[model samples]
Target: MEVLFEAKVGDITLKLAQGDITQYPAKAIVNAANKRLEHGGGVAYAIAKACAGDAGLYTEISKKAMREQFGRDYIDHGEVVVTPAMNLEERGIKYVFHTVGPICSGMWSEELKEKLYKAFLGPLEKAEEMGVESIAFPAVSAGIYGCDAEKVVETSLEAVKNFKGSAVKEVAEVHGARKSAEVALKVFERSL
Candidate 1:
């Protein structure tokens, strides 16, 4: 897989690239996580492994902060939480923005679509709030969560295109799976 598409939204460069999310250099990287921020599988596992220090330490500290802010429940769909990147600074990522999206078990409902949209947008808004300009994102909910590829691509593009923040100047979709990158490229071509 390779970069299938690239475009400009406002001053931000929107990129769809095929590779591990941990390899990219961005001011921030988003972890497709649940409320618990468990590094169980998929993007979460990959991110946990790539953090600067011990994965458990990073998770524990991040979870503690999140729990303190919003209680010890699973993060609600569309809610976003931020944490330090820990040891990932060498990789050029400064922070981790975690957003909980719907676990698509079967039918994709309107609520799921809305949450997916928010999942993509929430981080960008946070980045703007944090004064960051670049961010690398994963296909939130489109991995083990079973979200449809087209929907994921569309929601992603829609969120990026609609973001009003001036701080977000680059958005990279770091896809771990070939299918996701392919579909993102296909949908992105049409959206263009």
Candidate 2:
């Protein structure tokens, strides 16, 4: 993994890194998850493979909480839930922040943009609440959701900048491809 770009602003260190989000090892890794906690495809599957013992085990752990607490079968878009990082310990992850992002054209709505914003913001708030100092995130809605890369990058950076006094002081936006990293680097540089 390589750090493609880096900048320091205010109290946070922002990073645009090209690599697997699962291997980046931030204390919290945000999963571009779905409502049902399924990790069947795309970035979700890769993260589950790298971070958990089994897909079934990961599904159970995630579903149990969403089912038990909310009495619901699935989490709402923009909602976030915390689960143990299991096999990801060697990667320095303590918790997984499963955040459900919009699917397809749902990513285009102002409402969905807000949802994606919350998708990032919610995990940071949760990490701070748990006393975690650092977190890493994937480009939330940019994957199978078919979100515009430019918008996803812009909104994601905006969420980071809009946050208040959070304990989380470092955020790495990890991209699976060099192209994605390159696109994010532009947005990240502009934000600073």
lDDT of each: 0.83, 0.83
Q: What is candidate 1's lDDT per residue for 1-192, written digit by digit as tens?
A: 367788987788888899977778789999999778877777787787778446666678768868876787467766678877877887678888888878896559888999899999889998999999899999888877899888888988999898998878888988877876887888989997
Which digits, one per residue and each the tens of the lDDT, describe model 2 over residues 1-192? 899888875688888899988888599999998889888888888877766656766877888877876688788765678887888987789888888877755347787788888888888788778889889999888887888888888988888888775587898889999998898888877778
lDDT of 2 at 25: 57
Candidate 2 has what TM-score? Answer: 0.93
**lDDT score for candidate 1 against the true structure:** 0.83
- My TM-score estimates for the predictions, one after another, are 0.93, 0.93
Q: For residue 164, give model 2's deviation from the true position in Å.
A: 1.3
Candidate 2 runs further than 4 Å off: none
TM-score of candidate 1 versus the correct structure, residues matched by position? 0.93
